Amino acid sequence: GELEALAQELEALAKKLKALAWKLKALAQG
Amino acid sequence: GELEALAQELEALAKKLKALAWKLKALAQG
Amino acid sequence: GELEALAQELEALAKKLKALAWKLKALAQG
Amino acid sequence: GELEALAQELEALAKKLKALAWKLKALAQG
């Protein structure tokens, strides 16, 4: 129900955080 | 340097968020 | 400028995580 | 029980994310 919806949103947020990490990695190289 | 150290911290936090997401999915089913 | 923009993205994401945690507590309590 | 504890973990992780965002802002200006 709602708890499964919230779990899928959290996974989406985790994926987003990983993307932001690698954007920072990208900026860090040059 | 400092930015790569920080990017590493964000990577680890993203991995922790995924762990939490999967714990939530387990709860949504249990 | 890009570093500051990335930081604002991290803040936006943290805000969503806090909002999600509130919803988890609401569901657990009710 | 478990859901409340996970929500607390998520709130702690959001705070750690805000900390890294402020560290990024400091580096962007430092």
Measure the CA–CA gap between C20 and B4, rounded to whole angstroms: 28
Q: How many other CB atoms are there within 10 angstroms of residue D22's CB atom? A: 13
Token digits for C7? 């930081």
N- to C-terminal Cα separation, chain A: 45
Structure determined by: X-ray
Chain B residues whose CB is inside 8 A of the A24 CB are: 3, 6-7, 10
Instruction: For chain A, say whether D13 makes contact (Cβ under 8 Å).
Output: no
Measure the CA–CA gap between D17 and D23, rounded to whole angstroms: 10
Give the C-alpha distances (Å, rounded to integers) separating B29 from C5, C12, C16, C24.
38, 29, 23, 15
- Rounded to 5 degrees, what angle do the CA atoms B11, A15, D18 make? 55
Instruction: For chain B, say whether A27 makes contact (Cβ under 8 Å).
Output: yes
Hunting for tokens 């930081």 — which residue is that? C7
Q: How many other CB atoms are there within 10 angstroms of residue B21's CB atom? A: 22
Q: How far does D23 lie from chain C, in Å, by closest CA?
A: 9
Subunits with 3+ Cβ pairs within 8 Å of B are: A, C, D
- Residue type present at position C23: K
Resolution of the determined structure in angstroms stands at 1.9
